[PDB]
């Protein structure tokens, strides 16, 4: 495994930018396949979120990062919230792909926001990516 923030960026690359990873990973590759399915099925809800939100800017990407932190503002985390955060970041990446500079700022900051939003200690104390995959196979 590459490191949490790095792995999340890869998830945004594979799921948001639809950039097929060249090598298969036992844990991350199925997770990426699950998040893509979540984007497809819940596209309408993600569109509703960002409907009247002006996020195509560095200021907007900052607020998108704040949006991730708002998920766990009550101090609670589960793999459901973790998936919503990771899928939301991927969806954001997809909408910024045709704007190189904004896309790259998103890739630069949002992986760290998603990781913090989940909670680094909670992530590690619940099995990390193995725990997430197990949750995915059971729910999706």
């Amino acid at each position: 495994l590459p490191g949490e923030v790095l792995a999340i960026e890869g998830i945004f690359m594979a799921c948001g930018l639809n950039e097929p990873e060249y090598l298969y990973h036992p844990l991350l590759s199925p997770i990426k396949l699950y998040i893509t399915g979540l984007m497809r099925d819940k596209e309408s809800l993600f569109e509703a979120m960002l409907a009247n939100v002006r996020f195509h800017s560095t200021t907007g990407i900052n607020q998108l990062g704040l949006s991730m932190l708002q998920v766990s503002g009550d101090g609670n985390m589960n793999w459901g919230r973790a998936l919503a955060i990771l899928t939301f970041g991927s969806f954001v990446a997809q909408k910024l792909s045709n704007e190189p500079h904004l896309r790259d700022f998103a890739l630069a900051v949002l992986p760290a926001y998603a990781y913090e939003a989940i909670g680094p200690q909670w992530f590690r104390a619940r099995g990390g990516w193995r725990g997430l995959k197990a949750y995915c196979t059971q729910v999706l």
Partner: peptide, 25 residues
């Protein structure tokens, strides 16, 4: 003008449905 919390609540609601699937017997 701020819209981060509303998105946070909508992500929470989306997570609720996933957790409902996890808890389904």
């Amino acid at each position: 003008e701020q819209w981060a919390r509303e998105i946070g609540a909508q992500l929470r609601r989306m997570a609720d449905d996933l957790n409902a699937q996890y808890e389904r017997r």
